[PDB]
């Protein structure tokens, strides 16, 4: 009964926004995705790449079918919408800070749906784009999401971040802050 | 500014192993929105409707007989085999955590309450950190932030210990993790 | 035993989608895709892109064209459009953007590829089928001598199927199965376009090539 | 070492 690892392979199509997502995943991390509109497989870590494969185009034919199913489906239920759920966000840093050493910066938002958020940086007030990058939407076991953003950084004595949360499930946009605290 | 109603359709496929690839189960599901209509399971063998709106296809896709051997067989085309695969970068996947103490004032009223023990970059989430006053451990008053996966194949966490430290005093943080040997630890001089 | 498209298929799987009854897009449906690469910069792509969705078009029923007598031909035929849809939905997205044009258009090829792919692997697969494609092919090499020099008067489109009637009329395949005789009709078709000396023939059909080479 | 997937399946009818 003891459970060691569990690999998912998790797709899902979204209507009006006609986007899908093919991806793997290992005990909760991403293996890897495909890139739908490049049709192309991208590891979450160049180091995969040069040990396994994976043929992108099996990804183009599940979604291909998952979107005929979205329509079907969406028909079949007499037109139910799915229930907006706002995500929690919470910033942390990649490890303790220090002045001027390197660190990163971490927006975690989690438990949310649909699988749609607009997600922005902010330096004192400045959105920051430089060196930024995201994960797909990860999967969860009660079929909400979770999705983590990156801001690699140099700290300083003289600035405030806050990851800013846009969602259907939100009243106004959320904001999360982090100045060392 | 976009108020159109969204519709969202799910598939899952759940390969489940226990005691390396000895005991295996397979599970796939489909969810409408946020609800599993139907699934899969390799225990079972056959589809089965877990609401109402997934009878239709239980009963169509059983009817298959040549898709429930393919069903049946997944747990070694599939399962097992993307399982061995990835073993290399995944199963065996190690990092060795970081691990920093410095302390911290549980109220900006407050001398200098707690240590913290940073333990940051590891990999598997599987760890164990304890704290030392002189040798001695000391339970009952740490804290953490619990396990925190990063999204990047990385775990990180905090280990606080509530303690007015006094001078003569040697604290220590030890952790004990899958990519080392023998215990890492950092020590605090009061 | 028999050609495949694809010599040593790799193993391709169903996804039960053979009941669909509406994937191919209609004209209009198209138009209106094409009307959203409205910047010049992008008009000599949009040329490349309708001219794939073309040859698309073709190579999909040209599938059907061949083989609507392998159950599977659905499969692989619907497959082929609902792929299209999903790279629809960028192009829809980034109709000014050449150099996904430029992708969605190497990507349709691959779809192409993937279907003669699925296509040989089914074929493989179903050994009954191969048997009576190639009974097809045999008979209407006989016919290709048979017919040497008679009246091939197919203006009225009656005198292809009499022939047909005439010569294997009682063989249990023409008689029970409408996809091989079709065949075998559409044969004397091409039989009269090589009599009358017509050399683009091989390259009409896979069933064509068959027949006509050696 | 390449990973294979499971055939999405089109819902009844």
């Given at each position: 009964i003891k459970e060691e690892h569990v690999i998912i392979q998790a797709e899902f199509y979204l209507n009006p926004d006609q986007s899908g997502?093919?991806?793997?995943?290992?005990?909760?991390?991403?293996?890897?995705?495909?890139?739908?509109?490049?049709?192309?497989?991208?590891?979450?870590?160049?180091?995969?790449?040069?040990?396994?494969?994976?043929?992108?185009?099996?990804?183009?034919?599940?979604?291909?079918?998952?979107?005929?199913?979205?329509?079907?489906?969406?028909?079949?239920?007499?037109?139910?919408?799915?229930?907006?759920?706002?995500?929690?966000?919470?910033?942390?840093?990649?490890?303790?800070?220090?002045?001027?050493?390197?660190?990163?910066?971490?927006?975690?938002?989690?438990?949310?749906?649909?699988?749609?958020?607009?997600?922005?940086?902010?330096?004192?007030?400045?959105?920051?784009?430089?060196?930024?990058?995201?994960?797909?939407?990860?999967?969860?076991?009660?079929?909400?999401?979770?999705?983590?953003?990156?801001?690699?950084?140099?700290?300083?004595?003289?600035?405030?971040?806050?990851?800013?949360?846009?969602?259907?499930?939100?009243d106004e946009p959320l904001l999360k802050h982090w100045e060392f605290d | 500014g976009d108020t159109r109603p969204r519709f969202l359709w799910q598939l899952k496929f759940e390969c489940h192993f226990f005691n390396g690839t000895e005991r295996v189960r397979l599970l796939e599901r489909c969810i409408y929105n946020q609800?599993?209509?139907?699934?899969?399971?390799?225990?079972?063998?056959?589809?089965?409707?877990?609401?109402?709106?997934?009878?239709?296809?239980?009963?169509?896709?059983?009817?298959?007989?040549?898709?429930?051997?393919?069903?049946?067989?997944?747990?070694?085309?599939?399962?097992?085999?993307?399982?061995?695969?990835?073993?290399?970068?995944?199963?065996?996947?190690?990092?060795?955590?970081?691990?920093?103490?410095?302390?911290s004032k549980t109220q900006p009223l407050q001398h200098h309450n707690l240590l913290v023990c940073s333990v940051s970059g590891f990999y598997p989430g599987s760890i164990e950190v304890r704290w030392f006053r002189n040798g001695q451990e000391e339970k009952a008053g740490v804290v953490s932030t619990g396990l925190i996966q990063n999204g990047d194949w990385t775990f990180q966490t905090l280990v606080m210990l509530e303690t007015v430290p006094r001078s003569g005093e040697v604290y220590t943080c030890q952790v004990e993790h899958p990519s080392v040997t023998s215990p890492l630890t950092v020590e605090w001089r009061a | 035993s028999m050609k495949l498209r694809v010599e040593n298929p790799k193993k391709a799987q169903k996804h039960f989608v053979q009941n669909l009854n509406n994937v191919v897009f209609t004209n209009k449906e198209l138009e209106d895709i094409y009307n959203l690469s409205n910047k010049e910069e992008t008009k000599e792509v949009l040329k490349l892109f309708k001219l794939k969705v073309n040859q698309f078009y073709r190579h999909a029923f040209g599938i059907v064209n061949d083989y609507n007598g392998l159950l599977e031909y659905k499969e692989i035929f619907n497959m082929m459009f609902l792929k299209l849809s999903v790279v629809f939905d960028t192009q829809r997205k980034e109709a000014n953007n050449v150099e996904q044009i430029k992708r969605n258009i190497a990507i349709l090829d691959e779809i192409m590829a993937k279907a003669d792919n699925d296509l040989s692997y089914f074929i493989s697969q179903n050994k009954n089928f191969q048997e009576l494609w190639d009974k097809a092919v045999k008979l209407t090499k006989e016919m290709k001598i048979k017919l040497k020099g008679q009246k091939l008067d197919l203006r009225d489109g009656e005198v292809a199927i009499n022939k047909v009637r005439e010569l294997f009329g009682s063989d249990k395949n023409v008689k029970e199965l409408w996809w091989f005789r079709s065949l075998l009709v559409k044969g004397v078709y091409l039989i009269k376009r090589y009599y009358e000396g017509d050399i683009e023939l091989k390259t009409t059909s896979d069933f064509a090539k068959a027949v006509f080479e050696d | 070492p390449k990973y294979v997937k499971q055939n999405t399946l089109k819902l009844a009818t």
């Amino acid at each position: 009964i003891k459970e060691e690892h569990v690999i998912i392979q998790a797709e899902f199509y979204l209507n009006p926004d006609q986007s899908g997502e093919f991806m793997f995943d290992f005990d909760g991390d991403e293996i890897f995705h495909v890139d739908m509109a490049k049709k192309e497989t991208v590891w979450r870590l160049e180091e995969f790449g040069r040990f396994a494969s994976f043929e992108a185009q099996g990804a183009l034919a599940n979604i291909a079918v998952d979107k005929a199913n979205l329509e079907i489906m969406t028909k079949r239920s007499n037109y139910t919408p799915i229930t907006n759920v706002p995500p929690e966000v919470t910033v942390l840093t990649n490890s303790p800070v220090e002045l001027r050493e390197p660190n990163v910066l971490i927006c975690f938002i989690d438990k949310f749906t649909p699988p749609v958020v607009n997600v922005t940086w902010l330096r004192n007030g400045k959105p920051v784009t430089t060196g930024v990058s995201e994960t797909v939407f990860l999967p969860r076991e009660d079929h909400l999401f979770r999705k983590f953003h990156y801001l690699p950084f140099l700290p300083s004595t003289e600035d405030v971040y806050d990851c800013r949360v846009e969602h259907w499930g939100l009243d106004e946009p959320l904001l999360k802050h982090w100045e060392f605290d | 500014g976009d108020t159109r109603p969204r519709f969202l359709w799910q598939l899952k496929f759940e390969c489940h192993f226990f005691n390396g690839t000895e005991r295996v189960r397979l599970l796939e599901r489909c969810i409408y929105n946020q609800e599993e209509s139907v699934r899969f399971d390799s225990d079972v063998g056959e589809y089965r409707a877990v609401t109402e709106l997934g009878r239709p296809d239980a009963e169509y896709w059983n009817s298959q007989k040549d898709l429930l051997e393919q069903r049946r067989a997944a747990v070694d085309t599939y399962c097992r085999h993307n399982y061995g695969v990835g073993e290399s970068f995944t199963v065996q996947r190690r990092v060795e955590p970081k691990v920093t103490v410095y302390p911290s004032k549980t109220q900006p009223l407050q001398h200098h309450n707690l240590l913290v023990c940073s333990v940051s970059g590891f990999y598997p989430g599987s760890i164990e950190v304890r704290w030392f006053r002189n040798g001695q451990e000391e339970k009952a008053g740490v804290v953490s932030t619990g396990l925190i996966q990063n999204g990047d194949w990385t775990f990180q966490t905090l280990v606080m210990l509530e303690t007015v430290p006094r001078s003569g005093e040697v604290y220590t943080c030890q952790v004990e993790h899958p990519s080392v040997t023998s215990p890492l630890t950092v020590e605090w001089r009061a | 035993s028999m050609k495949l498209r694809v010599e040593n298929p790799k193993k391709a799987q169903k996804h039960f989608v053979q009941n669909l009854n509406n994937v191919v897009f209609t004209n209009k449906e198209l138009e209106d895709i094409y009307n959203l690469s409205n910047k010049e910069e992008t008009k000599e792509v949009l040329k490349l892109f309708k001219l794939k969705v073309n040859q698309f078009y073709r190579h999909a029923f040209g599938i059907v064209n061949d083989y609507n007598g392998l159950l599977e031909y659905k499969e692989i035929f619907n497959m082929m459009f609902l792929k299209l849809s999903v790279v629809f939905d960028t192009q829809r997205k980034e109709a000014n953007n050449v150099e996904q044009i430029k992708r969605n258009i190497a990507i349709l090829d691959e779809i192409m590829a993937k279907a003669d792919n699925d296509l040989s692997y089914f074929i493989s697969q179903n050994k009954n089928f191969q048997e009576l494609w190639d009974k097809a092919v045999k008979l209407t090499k006989e016919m290709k001598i048979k017919l040497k020099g008679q009246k091939l008067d197919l203006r009225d489109g009656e005198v292809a199927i009499n022939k047909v009637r005439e010569l294997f009329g009682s063989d249990k395949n023409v008689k029970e199965l409408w996809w091989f005789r079709s065949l075998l009709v559409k044969g004397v078709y091409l039989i009269k376009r090589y009599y009358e000396g017509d050399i683009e023939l091989k390259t009409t059909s896979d069933f064509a090539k068959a027949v006509f080479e050696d | 070492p390449k990973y294979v997937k499971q055939n999405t399946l089109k819902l009844a009818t």
